[PDB]
Design an enzyme around this catalytic site. Structure first.
Site, PDB file in Angstrom:
ATOM      1  N   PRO A   1       0.811  -1.235   0.000  1.00  0.00           N
ATOM      2  CG  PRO A   1      -0.469  -1.527   1.885  1.00  0.00           C
ATOM      3  CD  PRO A   1       0.876  -1.827   1.345  1.00  0.00           C
TER       4      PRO A   1
ATOM      5  CE  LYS B   1      -2.357  -5.775   1.176  1.00  0.00           C
ATOM      6  NZ  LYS B   1      -1.965  -5.466  -0.221  1.00  0.00           N
TER       7      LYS B   1
ATOM      8  CB  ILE C   1      -1.445  -5.377  -4.449  1.00  0.00           C
ATOM      9  CG1 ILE C   1      -0.406  -4.492  -5.149  1.00  0.00           C
ATOM     10  CG2 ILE C   1      -1.694  -6.621  -5.328  1.00  0.00           C
ATOM     11  CD1 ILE C   1       1.045  -5.075  -5.211  1.00  0.00           C
TER      12      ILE C   1
ATOM     13  CG  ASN D   1      -9.008   9.962  -6.250  1.00  0.00           C
ATOM     14  OD1 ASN D   1     -10.203  10.029  -6.120  1.00  0.00           O
ATOM     15  ND2 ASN D   1      -8.296  10.885  -6.898  1.00  0.00           N
TER      16      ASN D   1
HETATM   17  C1  LIG Z   1       1.824  -1.621  -0.936  1.00  0.00           C
HETATM   18  C2  LIG Z   1       1.890  -3.097  -1.129  1.00  0.00           C
HETATM   19  O1  LIG Z   1       2.994  -3.543  -1.397  1.00  0.00           O
HETATM   20  C3  LIG Z   1       0.637  -4.043  -1.111  1.00  0.00           C
HETATM   21  O2  LIG Z   1       0.793  -5.186  -0.634  1.00  0.00           O
HETATM   22  O3  LIG Z   1      -0.456  -3.597  -1.542  1.00  0.00           O
HETATM   23  C4  LIG Z   1       1.612  -0.955  -2.317  1.00  0.00           C
HETATM   24  C5  LIG Z   1       0.388  -1.158  -3.000  1.00  0.00           C
HETATM   25  C6  LIG Z   1       0.127  -0.576  -4.259  1.00  0.00           C
HETATM   26  C7  LIG Z   1       1.147   0.213  -4.832  1.00  0.00           C
HETATM   27  O4  LIG Z   1       0.876   0.778  -6.029  1.00  0.00           O
HETATM   28  C8  LIG Z   1       2.379   0.441  -4.224  1.00  0.00           C
HETATM   29  C9  LIG Z   1       2.620  -0.153  -2.951  1.00  0.00           C
HETATM   30  C1  LIG Z   2     -15.352  15.412  -7.991  1.00  0.00           C
HETATM   31  C2  LIG Z   2     -16.773  14.870  -7.854  1.00  0.00           C
HETATM   32  O1  LIG Z   2     -17.316  14.960  -6.750  1.00  0.00           O
HETATM   33  C3  LIG Z   2     -17.521  14.165  -9.018  1.00  0.00           C
HETATM   34  O2  LIG Z   2     -18.709  13.800  -8.814  1.00  0.00           O
HETATM   35  O3  LIG Z   2     -16.877  14.007 -10.092  1.00  0.00           O
HETATM   36  C4  LIG Z   2     -14.304  14.244  -7.850  1.00  0.00           C
HETATM   37  C5  LIG Z   2     -14.183  13.300  -8.891  1.00  0.00           C
HETATM   38  C6  LIG Z   2     -13.259  12.252  -8.864  1.00  0.00           C
HETATM   39  C7  LIG Z   2     -12.424  12.104  -7.751  1.00  0.00           C
HETATM   40  O4  LIG Z   2     -11.526  11.039  -7.754  1.00  0.00           O
HETATM   41  C8  LIG Z   2     -12.520  12.994  -6.656  1.00  0.00           C
HETATM   42  C9  LIG Z   2     -13.462  14.061  -6.717  1.00  0.00           C
END
Ligand SMILES: *[C@@H](C(=O)C(=O)O)c1ccc(O)cc1
Ligand SMILES: *[C@@H](C(=O)C(=O)O)c1ccc(O)cc1
Ligand SMILES: *[C@@H](C(=O)C(=O)O)c1ccc(O)cc1
Lengths: 114, 114, 114
Positions: C1, C32, C64, C97
């Site tokens: 993450p 994790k 992930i 997000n």
């Molecule tokens: C953290 C990670 O390694 C996991 O196990 O999810 C991580 C996740 C997603 C991204 O893009 C980078 C690091």
């Molecule tokens: C703005 C929003 O509220 C919408 O309805 O589009 C917004 C859109 C997408 C993300 O990831 C954050 C805010």
């Protein structure tokens, strides 16, 4: 919607009222209320475009819908024009990444939009 | 393609010519002409990796195509190697997010690549 | 993450130990190990939310797996809560997000997680 601009243009060259102008123009373009629009401007960045350090910008627009082929061309015209007029960046030195977000993947106000 | 490096290394440790070297190496690796490649380096960041503040980097590579299982392994070896040699960051404290973008979702020069 | 916070709150308003706190809370929330968790805090940003420059935050959580409808609500409560508690940001001025990343598209230590 959230709009981010990363640019090598200096902070001093970002005009007063620019974030509010972006908010209003995005509100008009996307049809969404201005109170939901977030804008983020990052000046003074170490960047190159095509190997050159002339003014450039890397932008992203995230939106829950209102993303697609025709709409993205309209956004690009609108946003390149604003960046050219206000920050003096050539449109052929701007990239804008468009992301159509699922509402379940946007968190806000201790929940998500799902 | 566009490549972005966030790191807690200080700006002074980013060597001269680094943006050009990244542009050249990504052109070689992706097979795209250097005039298309955008690079953004963000030093001096407040970051932790595994709960520690030793040098680390969080990167993104966005490309229209040329993204995939074996290609991404190759890019990681190349980019971790550069970051280790030039910024003295250990490869196990680097994450690189790879994004295959649709040409309709990349704006440039008042339109999109679609 | 990996978890990124972009905020207009000043650098001085970010409590020491905030990165470590974020790392532990995320390790507990995602299940994790903290060795894998990267955190990046970007204060002092030029931002607006709803046309207004009061404190706000735009965040991203990439994982992930462990991304989904119910998970994302529990994440949003936790993170909104922590940003409100520690940076004094109102939870209705935060966007998070969420991205579910394929392991083949995350590079680390000269390879990928695939
Ligand atoms: C953290 C990670 O390694 C996991 O196990 O999810 C991580 C996740 C997603 C991204 O893009 C980078 C690091
Ligand atoms: C703005 C929003 O509220 C919408 O309805 O589009 C917004 C859109 C997408 C993300 O990831 C954050 C805010
Ligand atoms: C570089 C580019 O134009 C290509 O041919 O891939 C590029 C790729 C992806 C994004 O999002 C921006 C620029």
């Amino acid at each position: 919607p959230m709009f981010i601009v990363n640019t090598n243009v200096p902070r001093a060259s970002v005009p007063d009222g620019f974030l509010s102008e972006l908010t209003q123009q995005l509100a008009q373009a996307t049809g969404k209320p201005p109170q939901y629009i977030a804008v983020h401007v990052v000046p003074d960045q170490l960047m190159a475009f095509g190997g050159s350090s002339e003014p450039c910008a890397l932008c992203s627009l995230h939106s829950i819908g209102k993303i697609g082929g025709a709409q993205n061309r309209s956004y690009s015209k609108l946003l390149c024009g604003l960046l050219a007029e206000r920050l003096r960046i050539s449109p052929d030195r701007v990239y804008i990444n468009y992301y159509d977000m699922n509402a379940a993947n946007v968190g806000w106000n201790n929940s998500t939009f799902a």
